[PDB]
Write a protein that binds this ligand. Sequence first.
Ligand SMILES: O=S(=O)(O)c1cc2c(O)c(c1)Cc1cc(S(=O)(=O)O)cc(c1O)Cc1cc(S(=O)(=O)O)cc(c1O)Cc1cc(S(=O)(=O)O)cc(c1O)C2
Ligand code: HEM
Length: 108
Amino acid sequence: TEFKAGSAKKGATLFKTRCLQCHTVEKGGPHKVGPNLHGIFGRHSGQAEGYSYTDANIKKNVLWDENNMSEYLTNPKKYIPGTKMAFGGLKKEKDRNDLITYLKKATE
Ligand SMILES: O=S(=O)(O)c1cc2c(O)c(c1)Cc1cc(S(=O)(=O)O)cc(c1O)Cc1cc(S(=O)(=O)O)cc(c1O)Cc1cc(S(=O)(=O)O)cc(c1O)C2
Ligand code: HEM
């Protein structure tokens, strides 16, 4: 995938409707079904303090960046088979760019 900076404003709404059910973004925010995502970019997968991940998410050991995040969010279980993230994917490229643009800001 080839991430292109988009609209964090539209990304924020996508996060609310598609991700917030299972994730927080703020520093020190609580885990839910999924891990809090603060600091995700530039850290390896499966490392949020205090959260119990699948073996798949840990052993994937990917250094998250905007491009591999775009691939992941297209189809999570294809990128990380054995994941327990029950999310089908954002099939639209502009949605992925906008969501990732938001996520970069929100998880800083
Ligand atoms: O306000 S924005 O900065 O987000 C904006 C950027 C672009 C835009 O063309 C528009 C808004 C108008 C517009 C908005 C939306 S919305 O996010 O749903 O509100 C959707 C579209 C649109 O033209 C339609 C559209 C959809 C898709 S798809 O989801 O991938 O199928 C792609 C595009 C669309 O125009 C092409 C496109 C991509 C991108 S990208 O950020 O490079 O992916 C920016 C802009 C684009 O027109 C350039
Ligand atoms: C597009 C919206 C979403 C985004 C941006 C997102 C983002 C992420 C990211 C980046 C990871 C990897 C975290 C890491 O490696 O530390 C992850 C894992 C996870 N997510 Fe999501 N997610 C979304 C939707 C969801 C939804 C809707 C759910 C719940 C139904 C969910 C539940 C989980 C779970 C359980 C994990 C850990 C998976 C595992 O251990 O295998 N996510 N998510």
